Design a protein around this ligand. Structure first.
Ligand code: BMQ
Ligand code: BMQ
Lengths: 218, 217
């Protein structure tokens, strides 16, 4: 599995190139894995991935929550990996064929797919939660090795970890701003995803250091 | 929304030159283009303004927004700043995520399209069973624009029943995926067509032919 420094992944959702670069650089010594999503990509373009690679020694996870038909998912993955992304996050709710499409491109292109099972926000309880266990099982059957689960629901994150097994890699968002606790999250997830708690702080570096200091024994 | 010839072009080519050429080749048949991630992630968001400058067509950003409320807001804002007239949002992530999109749409004078059931085989696993409930949620939220599957006319009909004849419904899966344009239009206000047109030896003749088959509609 990817070696995530300090088990901490930065969710860089700032929408300004200068601010995104400044903050990421300020926490460079604490994090070597950055999750870049559409807020930043749709604001600065896919070239932002290249810029981050040039400026920092950071791994890039493209959080595009791919959720289209197989044919379109394939094109999205190809474009994303072509841009230099190490991994891409895909939704499992659209079904096995849509996930397989992403897995095939990742295999062909030598990159990785992360399967988003349950989400961390309140609305996830409406439809996603009830399908989450099956989505995770589907991922295991498809050979998925990387997963995303909610830090906001410990009991659910724990169940997801059980389904995918100790060997699978699991990252979890919802830490900090959404209420998730770093330590408790890491009882099940390999790495915690943190956005606002870090990028909106007066001193991102101190915020990151604080989170890391709280999970030092872990 | 007034879609010319009840035909929306799904421009999923990933080359600026080809995308622009093909769209221009069928411009006389349409005035509504659906631009998705295949083109946007390959050529950038500036492509939307370019289409408006060259064709004046209305643009539907098919981004199947499916994140938490806070991120959805940012995605819609970035998308509408680029000049999109509407954005397609997944209903599966729940009401709060849809509401976030509705808020930005209202603020920037744009429209939100709610995707309720998808057209591919995999949609049967999880989406289909929640589709009716997702459509009702859309009604409860005041959503007026919807997306339903051409590949399952009975499901497209049920969606129309739920949202009413007043709501606007567009439907993909026509052509390449097996959907019939005429049957699709019995329920949807407009049919979305991609490959059957942009991969045709002659895109214009392909579009003309589709329109020819639905001229009585
Ligand atoms: O269930 C999920 C999935 C996900 O990717 N995310 C993303 O994780 C990040 C969370 O950031 P934040 O720490 O709440 O500011 C954002 O980029 C979200 O889009 C989430 O919050 N919930
Ligand atoms: O259920 C759905 C939703 C959707 O937007 N689409 C999109 O509609 C278009 C269909 O294109 P095509 O006519 O099959 O080539 C693509 O851009 C798809 O991503 C779909 O095919 N099914």
């Amino acid at each position: 599995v990817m070696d995530v420094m300090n088990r901490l992944i930065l969710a860089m959702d700032l929408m300004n190139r200068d601010d995104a670069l400044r903050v990421t650089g300020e926490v460079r010594e604490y994090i070597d894995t950055v999750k870049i999503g559409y807020p930043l990509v749709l604001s600065e373009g896919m070239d932002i991935i290249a810029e981050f690679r040039k400026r920092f020694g950071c791994r890039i996870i493209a959080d595009f929550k791919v959720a289209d038909i197989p044919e379109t998912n394939e094109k999205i993955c190809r474009a994303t990996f072509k841009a230099g992304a190490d991994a891409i996050i895909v939704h499992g709710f659209p079904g096995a064929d849509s996930v397989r499409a992403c897995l095939n491109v990742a295999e062909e292109m030598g990159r990785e797919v992360f399967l988003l099972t349950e989400m961390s926000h309140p609305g996830a309880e409406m439809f996603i939660q009830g399908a989450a266990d099956e989505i995770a099982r589907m991922g295991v059957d498809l050979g998925v090795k990387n997963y995303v689960g909610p830090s906001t629901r410990p009991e659910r994150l724990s169940r997801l970890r059980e389904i995918i097994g100790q060997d699978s890699f699991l990252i979890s968002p919802g830490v900090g701003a959404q209420g998730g606790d770093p330590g408790e999250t890491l009882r099940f997830a390999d790495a915690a995803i943190v956005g606002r708690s870090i990028y909106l702080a007066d001193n991102p570096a101190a915020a990151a250091a604080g989170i890391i200091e709280s999970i030092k024994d872990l």
